[PDB]
Design a protein around this ligand. Structure first.
Ligand SMILES: *[C@@H]1O[C@H](CO[C@@H]2O[C@@H](C)[C@@H](O)[C@@H](O)[C@@H]2O)[C@@H](O[C@@H]2O[C@H](CO)[C@@H](O[C@H]3O[C@H](CO[C@H]4O[C@H](CO)[C@@H](O)[C@H](O)[C@@H]4O[C@@H]4O[C@H](CO)[C@@H](O[C@@H]5O[C@H](CO)[C@H](O)[C@H](O)[C@H]5O)[C@H](O)[C@H]4NC(C)=O)[C@@H](O)[C@H](O[C@H]4O[C@H](CO)[C@@H](O)[C@H](O)[C@@H]4O)[C@@H]3O)[C@H](O)[C@H]2NC(C)=O)[C@H](O)[C@H]1NC(C)=O
Ligand SMILES: *[C@@H]1O[C@H](CO[C@@H]2O[C@@H](C)[C@@H](O)[C@@H](O)[C@@H]2O)[C@@H](O[C@@H]2O[C@H](CO)[C@@H](O[C@H]3O[C@H](CO[C@H]4O[C@H](CO)[C@@H](O)[C@H](O)[C@@H]4O[C@@H]4O[C@H](CO)[C@@H](O[C@@H]5O[C@H](CO)[C@H](O)[C@H](O)[C@H]5O)[C@H](O)[C@H]4NC(C)=O)[C@@H](O)[C@H](O[C@H]4O[C@H](CO)[C@@H](O)[C@H](O)[C@@H]4O)[C@@H]3O)[C@H](O)[C@H]2NC(C)=O)[C@H](O)[C@H]1NC(C)=O
Lengths: 34, 207, 209, 34
């Protein structure tokens, strides 16, 4: 697996600055990449 | 009439962003006479329409089997959303409902220990490398082995076992040629769990 | 919802291997109705009817059905030599009697290899440590594992179920948890294994610092 | 759990000197004893 995408996913999962839609949007973005 | 079973996603699928986790609703004992089956899916009480439903399959006992698959968001499953499958069939007087979600309770980080082969086993052509994973909750976990930046395939893992303190443990066993072990090659036990940083950790083992 | 269901269960591995114990086969009937509560059991050993079974009193379940159990004591040597045991269940709700048969797993037995593994260096930071027993290469999967120290049973251990290995044999692990101080003091711990392919059905391996 | 009793049971189980009825009798004797 790609370590970079896994790291980004985990950060977004636990990012205190985001609400659910913002978190969902960010994770969706990460998923599109690698 | 018919019977319904609802199954969770695979542990690795919920933890790795490169994978696609799904919940599976299975309907058994569907008759030849009333083969039409209807699925309504709900996520925390909200109806969703993106399920993928397969055509009926006839079974060895002459009943039909029908399956519906709902893809779920990683973060939704991990954050404890409830998934409900509601099945309608005319043979049923009223619809059947099943609900599942991630196990509740405080997550606990797995402790990972690697154990070399016994001195007794060094009389063999092949030897066993052991990975002990303990103290974790919930029981959803995945384990893999690698060496020299390549996956090792000759391993087997026990299912999770409930420990005395309410946490779980398991063992994973990798079998290798004794000569590779003695060569000083480094082997790594990879563990994936929601309580780990990045859902991933690795422990090494060598002579 | 008419028609009870029958399940037939083998003896415990330890009960068949130890002469002091008593192995038994268990026939369980579920979904017995309040309208049709009487259940009759006929037992057969290699096709010959036997009469020494004991029937348990009926028990009510949460779903308002009855559960009925019949237990047949068997000779150790009969089970180990592969005799077949048959349970035939009659109830008015059934169009015909239901029959189930079981026997010991067939095939050439293979003796378990038993290895003990000390705690990891990493684990010595804890108040308690894990002692490991690896048991591999055995067939069939019927096996029992126990731990002892100083001629006394140890109770704080757990054993994984048998797992099919790639070569068609089985393996398992057993984990004993002890106070670190007991380990550091040099106390000796023993992993006991029971299987039909072992001499005297028994072997023991020790573990100490 | 007695070591001696296990040995007697196992040998009797695999004793080539006995038929089924004799072995059953010997095993019962051991069972009565242990
Ligand atoms: C007619 O035949 C039907 C077929 O069943 C068959 O029966 C025999 C005669 C033979 O033909 C065989 O084909 C088969 O045995 C039969 O339907 C069965 O009905 C029984 C109940 O009567 C169901 O019972 C148990 O179901 C649960 C376990 O199911 C899993 O494990 C089974 C093996 O142990 C396996 O066969 C099942 O298919 C199922 O396997 C899991 O399936 C899920 C979903 O697909 C997998 O998860 C998905 O996997 C995907 C992979 O691409 C992907 O990863 C996705 O993300 C993921 O979601 C999962 O991986 C997979 N697991 C395994 C190990 O394979 C069990 O939990 C349940 O227990 C509950 O209910 C009991 C009620 O009795 C309670 O006692 C118990 O405590 C608990 O509450 C059931 O025990 C059985 O599942 C049905 N089988 C099938 C194939 O559907 C029908 O009953 C027959 N009718 C008559 C009249 O005889
Ligand atoms: C009404 O409610 C009934 C009970 O209530 C329910 O119970 C549970 C299970 C759950 O469903 C709850 O919702 C609810 O409270 C219910 O009855 C059940 O019916 C299903 C129907 O299939 C049965 O299904 C499976 O049964 C087999 C496994 O049973 C063992 O393991 C169960 C737990 O995993 C356990 O609950 C059982 O009691 C049974 O336990 C074993 O019992 C034996 C006998 O005592 C023990 O061995 C003996 O006992 C001594 C030790 O005390 C001694 O050692 C002796 O020598 C020894 O011989 C044994 O140790 C013990 N083991 C364990 C682990 O506890 C399973 O194999 C079977 O699979 C077959 O059939 C399937 C068909 O579905 C096939 O698909 C499959 O391939 C395979 O062929 C079943 O899957 C279930 O067992 C029943 N439960 C009970 C408690 O009896 C009933 O169905 C409900 N009715 C309705 C209409 O809903």
């Amino acid at each position: 697996f790609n370590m970079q995408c896994q790291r980004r996913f985990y950060e977004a999962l636990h990012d205190p600055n985001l609400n659910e839609e913002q978190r969902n949007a960010k994770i969706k973005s990460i998923r599109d990449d690698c | 009439g018919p019977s319904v079973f609802l199954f969770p996603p695979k542990p690795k699928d919920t933890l790795m962003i490169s994978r696609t986790p799904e919940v599976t609703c299975v309907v058994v004992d569907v008759s030849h006479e009333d083969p039409e089956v209807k699925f309504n899916w709900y996520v925390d009480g909200v109806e969703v329409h993106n399920a993928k439903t397969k055509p009926r399959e006839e079974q060895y006992n002459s009943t039909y089997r029908v399956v519906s698959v709902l893809t779920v968001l990683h973060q939704d499953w991990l954050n404890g959303k409830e998934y409900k499958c509601k099945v309608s069939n005319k043979a049923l007087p009223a619809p059947i409902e099943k609900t599942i979600s991630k196990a509740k309770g405080q997550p606990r980080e797995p402790q990972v220990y690697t154990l070399p082969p016994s001195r007794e086993e060094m009389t063999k052509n092949q030897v066993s490398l052991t990975c002990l994973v303990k103290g974790f909750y919930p029981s959803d976990i995945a384990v893999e082995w690698e060496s020299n930046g390549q996956p090792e395939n000759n391993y087997k893992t026990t299912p999770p076992v409930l420990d005395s303190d309410g946490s779980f443990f398991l063992y994973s066993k990798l079998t290798v040629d004794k000569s590779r072990w003695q060569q000083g090659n480094v082997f790594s036990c990879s563990v994936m769990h929601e309580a780990l940083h990045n859902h991933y950790t690795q422990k090494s083992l060598s002579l």
